[PDB]
């Protein structure tokens, strides 16, 4: 019953998550993932005391925009993928089918240059490097878009403030005109009779 929270604000703390995610249920502990140097990793893991609480948190934070700071950046929540590095898989869990032995035809050894192994694994490593450059390109694209949005925060906020105050100013003026005209109508009607 654990979920991962991404896109954390710049300054967050362990207790902030558990007091922010408590409105969906009784969280057990809320950890903000941190590296060796001590800076936040930008990812956090929260586990709930029950599956329905997790479902409610997931649905509500996915459909809505769960801000947890003055900084208007909603957090993205996804199920926490249980990955274990204690078991892995020993020999006994391997089915040991015909695929097992066909896959075990040579020991763990390097490929001699000039053999078919070498020119095929070189294609494989070229594919891996192309994967890495594609992922880096996507990461840099997202970083550029995010930095562009962060700069446009103040201008959008100020324009929204201007729009809101012009709107309610117009509604105040309409209220004034309506009150004045109804008062004039009613005084004329009362003096007519």
């Amino acid at each position: 019953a654990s979920l991962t929270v991404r896109n954390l604000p710049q300054y967050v703390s362990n207790e902030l998550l558990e007091e922010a995610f408590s409105v969906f249920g009784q969280v057990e502990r809320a950890v903000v993932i941190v590296d060796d140097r001590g800076r936040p990793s930008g990812k956090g893991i929260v586990e709930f005391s029950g599956k329905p609480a997790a479902r409610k948190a997931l649905d509500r934070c996915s459909e809505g925009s769960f801000l947890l700071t003055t900084f208007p950046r909603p957090v993205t929540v996804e199920p926490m993928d249980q990955l274990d590095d204690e078991e892995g898989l020993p020999e006994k869990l391997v089915i040991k089918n015909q695929q097992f032995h066909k896959e075990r035809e040579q020991p763990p050894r390097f490929a001699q240059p000039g053999s078919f192994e070498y020119e095929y694994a070189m294609r494989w490593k070229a594919l891996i490097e192309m994967e890495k450059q594609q992922q880096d390109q996507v990461d840099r694209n997202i970083k550029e878009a995010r930095e562009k949005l962060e700069m446009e925060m103040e201008a959008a906020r100020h324009e929204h403030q201007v729009m809101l105050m012009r709107q309610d100013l117009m509604r105040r003026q309409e209220e004034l005109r309506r009150m004045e005209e109804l008062h004039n109508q009613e005084v004329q009607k009362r003096k007519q009779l």
């Binding site: 703390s13 993932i33 925009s65 274990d84 590095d85 204690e86 892995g88 763990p108 994967e131 878009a145």
Partner: protein, 178 residues
């Protein structure tokens, strides 16, 4: 002295992964990463009893090519990033920042329709969705390239054998002519 490993066929297990890097030195524990279902995620972690063995393993597999299984799929090693999942960022270091307090003056909310925060969170959500689409496209491209390489198992080997035989015949003809 921990090295992070991926690009491994599922069938390689803990004992082969620990046997393979044994040539690099002592291996106390080399464990692969597996999801709940038991299927291997293709990522493995190797921890070394000594630092120099771990560094020279990376040095050797940086330029060389290393194979575990009959299928010629190389093994990629890189230094393993240390992440903490039990001790996050405490309040003490949190408040050393002077503007951490004034950043928290607004409680965790859900925004309100028509307010600026809701108007901007929509843009942020659109950015997140487009990021998800781009990542999914990259993963699909990778899946298709995986399939294309796996289909070319037999053709490449057959062509290589035919080419070796053809140069053998050509050199035999050249010797016979002389």
């Amino acid at each position: 002295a921990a090295l992070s490993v991926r690009n491994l066929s599922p069938y390689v297990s803990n004992e082969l992964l620990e046997e393979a890097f044994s040539q690099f030195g002592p291996i106390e524990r080399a464990v692969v990463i597996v999801d709940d279902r038991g299927r291997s995620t293709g990522k493995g972690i190797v921890e070394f009893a000594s630092k120099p063995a771990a560094r020279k393993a990376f040095e050797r597999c940086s330029e060389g090519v290393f194979l575990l299984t009959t299928t010629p799929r190389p093994v990629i090693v890189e230094p393993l990033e240390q992440l903490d999942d039990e001790d996050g960022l405490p309040e003490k270091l949190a408040q050393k920042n002077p503007m951490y307090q004034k950043e928290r003056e607004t409680p965790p909310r859900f925004a309100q329709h028509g307010t600026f925060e809701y108007e901007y969170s929509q843009r942020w959500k659109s950015l997140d969705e487009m990021e998800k689409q781009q990542r999914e496209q990259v993963e699909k491209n990778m899946k298709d390239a995986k399939d294309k390489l796996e289909s070319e198992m037999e053709d490449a080997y057959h062509e290589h054998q035919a080419n070796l035989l053809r140069q053998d015949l050509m050199r035999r003809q050249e010797e016979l002519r002389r």
